[PDB]
Amino acid sequence: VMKTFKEFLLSLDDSVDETEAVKRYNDYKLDFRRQQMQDFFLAHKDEEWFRSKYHPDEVGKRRQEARGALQNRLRVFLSLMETGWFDNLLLDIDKADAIVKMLDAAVIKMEGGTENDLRILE
Amino acid sequence: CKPRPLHKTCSLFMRNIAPNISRAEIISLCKRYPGFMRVALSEPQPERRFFRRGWVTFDRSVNIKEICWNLQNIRLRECELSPGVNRDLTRRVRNINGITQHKQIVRNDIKLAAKLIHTLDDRTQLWASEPGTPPLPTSLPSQNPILKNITDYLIERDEKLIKVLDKLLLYLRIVHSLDYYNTCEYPNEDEMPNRCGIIHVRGPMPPNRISHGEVLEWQKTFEEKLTPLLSVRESLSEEEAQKMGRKDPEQEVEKFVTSNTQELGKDKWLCPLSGKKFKGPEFVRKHIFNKHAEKIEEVKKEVAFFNNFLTDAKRPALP
């Protein structure tokens, strides 16, 4: 728990200035949030989610994983273009069934799906 | 050969996954159930003690009800998973206001979609020319074939103009997981059971005449929602970093060397790393940098690990 504006001023009851009241309180705020930040780092140090978000090695992995998986989705998109799944496909509710068939055809190709695997959608 | 239903997958969902539980532990648990594919984990939520929500997905040809009941009441590090059978996506193709098909908004949406792809392709380095070899300054990235000759259509309801727009949005949605018409991203889609789940779409033609005030109102509302999706990771100021107490790389390395150069007696020095005794202060200094060259750089990583946390503006913290 953090101290309010009144509680900090109760400590220094001697030379109570007008301008220097906000000086020492904001210095307390920065040094309180310094320790609270430091206590969080030591608490959630070894956890994977925190490691993954900030650690040099682990952040290097997730950029490499995501960029690899993102390239798989691009090669799927470019395969759908040249094969011809976006030919007579408009983004309207009238062609809602055609969009669902396309998205399933995309997800098939994402999972290493062959041209034979696409035949079930017919 | 036998054609498979790769688009179809039944899956579990997990409510309580403590942050100390690794991804590898959940994969290791769910691997023994045959027809296993992959585990997804949500961004942890600070209000609920940084616990995570999970999604274990399987091949469709498997009794998901049996797997759920079998997995029921198994606790990784004394933390109950409480799995349930995840439902199928029903309302796949949602819609939004029909005004979007109007020709003035279509032109505006091509401008914005092209701007989104330009940003997202550059950020991810998606079209890298020969990614294995190193990047020279004279090297350029490969062009996106959708972005070729776009402003020709902008300058000088139309079907051919919409076909250009749809290829931009279909790219955004299939590749980067950006649902354009809803103004939202599904960032962790490739791990989740439904790889490319929900898409939003232009509604039916409006009944009444489309007012020009309502056209400008939509375009104002649309761009205000899109700009949050182009968010830069906000780094704090270098004064604020030094005020909050950013650690220096080589200072901690110097603190590491001095701490591992202890004096036993007169002309007798020892390091805890190896345990070889030397007869000088800078004898142990030259020992550590040569023999334990991997150890001193591991400290530099732990410094950057603390600094990169500090650098972030919206840090994870207690509410």
Residue numbers in the entry:
A (entry chain A): 148 to 269
B (entry chain C): 411 to 566, 600 to 762
From the manuscript:
Based on this model, additional constructs for crystallisation were designed in which disordered loops A (538–552) and B (568–598) were truncated. Crystals of ARS2147–270+408–763Δ568–598 (Δloop B) diffracted to 3.37 Å resolution (space group C2221) and exhibited an ordered loop A. A composite model, including both loop A (from the ARS2147–270+408–763Δ568–598 structure) and most of loop B (from the ARS2147–270+408–763 structure) was artificially constructed and used for illustrative purposes since it is almost complete, only lacking residues 578–598. In mammals, loop A (538-ASEPGT543PPLPTSLPS-552) is highly conserved and proline-rich. In most crystal forms, the loop is disordered presumably due to flexibility. However, in the crystal form in which loop B (see below) was deleted, loop A is well structured in one monomer, likely due to crystal-packing constraints. Interestingly, T543 is a major phosphorylation site of human ARS2 (Discussion). Loop B (residues 566–598) is around 30-residues long in metazoans, half the length in S. pombe and absent in plants. In metazoans, the first part of the loop is highly acidic (566-EEVSAEEEELLG-577), whereas the second half of the loop is proline-rich, particularly in mammals. Elution from the resin shows that ARS2147–871, as well as various loop-deletion constructs used for crystallisation (ARS2171–270+408–763, ARS2147–270+408–763ΔloopB and ARS2171–270+408–763ΔloopAΔloopB) are all retained by the NCBP3 bound to the resin. Nevertheless, despite extensive co-crystallisation trials, including with the loop B/‘EEEE’ helix deletion mutant, we have never observed any electron density corresponding to FARB bound to ARS2 in a crystal, and all our biochemical evidence suggests that only the C-terminal foot is involved.
ARS2 is a direct interaction partner of CBC and together they form a platform for the assembly of co-transcriptional complexes that determine the fate of diverse RNA Pol II transcripts. Our structural analysis shows that ARS2 is made up of two regions, residues 147–270 and 408–763 that co-fold into a structured core with an intervening glutamate-rich region of unknown function that is likely unstructured. The human ARS2 core has an unusual structure comprising a largely helical ‘body’ from which project N- and C-terminal ‘legs’. We find that the RRM domain is required to bind RNA, whereas a basic patch in the C-terminal leg of ARS2 mediates the interaction with FLASH.
